[PDB]
Amino acid sequence: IVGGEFTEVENQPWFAAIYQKNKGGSPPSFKCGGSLISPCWVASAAHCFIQLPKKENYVVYLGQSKESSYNPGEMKFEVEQLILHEYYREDSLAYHNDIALLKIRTSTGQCAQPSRSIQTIALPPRFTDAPFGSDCEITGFGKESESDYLYPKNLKMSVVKLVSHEQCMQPHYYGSEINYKMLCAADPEWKTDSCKGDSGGPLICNIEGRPTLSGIVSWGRGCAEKNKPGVYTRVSHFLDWIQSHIG
Amino acid sequence: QVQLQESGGGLVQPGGSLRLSCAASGFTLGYYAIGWFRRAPGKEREGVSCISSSGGSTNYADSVKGRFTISRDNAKNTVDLQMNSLKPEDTAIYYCAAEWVPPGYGATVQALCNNAGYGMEYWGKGTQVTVSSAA
Ligand SMILES: *C[C@@](*)(O)[C@H](CCCNC(N)=[NH2+])NC(=O)CNC(=O)[C@@H](N)CCC(=O)O
To answer: Which cysteines are joined by disulfide bonds (chain A)?
Structure first.
């Protein structure tokens, strides 16, 4: 996340940190963000897993907070199912169907048990989005500049505004590389944005006064670049897909 | 190729002292938080004492406060547990366990230790500590 503030407990308790395992007793490497949509299910971006789409390579952590005491029995999860969208494609600049579902369980086989620091996030009604210009909040451990290589140490959150497709599909923006299964969002002052390492993390907009996973961090030319909003998987157009993989 | 191995087990008179050591091979133990857990013949596994990777945070079960002392050496790839004023109640199999604590949590290793060690990544096979008048 570029610009914005560092977060605490209960601020994004649906947030999931997704790590890739290293061989040997080497600690895993942070790979992507995610959102707890069900006690057993995390939604994230497919592009995060396309190189190594086997579930054994990942481990998910929940309830991150500076006031949360790490408990591996309840906060660490193996991935028992990793599902990428079957029509995920990489285009010239955009990703298509950039979404993935991770079924998680603890070492004793439980799903996520709610707490002050672990909550699910509600999905939008079908094809329903907050109006353009709405304030949504983004969250992650991604770079704090584009030009940086460093990932931050603690959880960050920021506020971006929804940008209409008409404005986003202007040629000096993204032109025809934005379709309606995507959602653009940016800082009107172009100083805050999500960046490398935020993919799969949430875009939380208020649907009728209720926090809602509207987007999943997917791509963008640069980070916080003028005329270049962050692009997000539009969750409202994937509800059937999602609920077809759960039930 | 990851291996954890405890050592130091034996039979000691009540009130006596005993030191355990956990050695690692195949990986760098210094990146890991380490917990000493024990299982008594009747009970289930409980956290005795834990220490964070840098050695800055420790936790002790109430049963052993002021009697047991955990420490570590990340140059020698070990974690020690000094046990003083031993009581018969301490008689158990003592396991060493290692877990990588991700960033973004509290500095404490309290929850790592209070929860009977469920979820800890790596385990040693354990060493026997027996406290009895038979010694
Ligand atoms: C994979 C996912 O974590 C990132 C998220 C980047 C968010 N984009 C913006 N504008 N906030 N998505 C990608 O890496 C997809 N590819 C790109 O964004 C590249 N055009 C830029 C690569 C880079 O800057 O690291």
So the answer is: 32-48, 40-111, 136-205, 168-184, 195-223
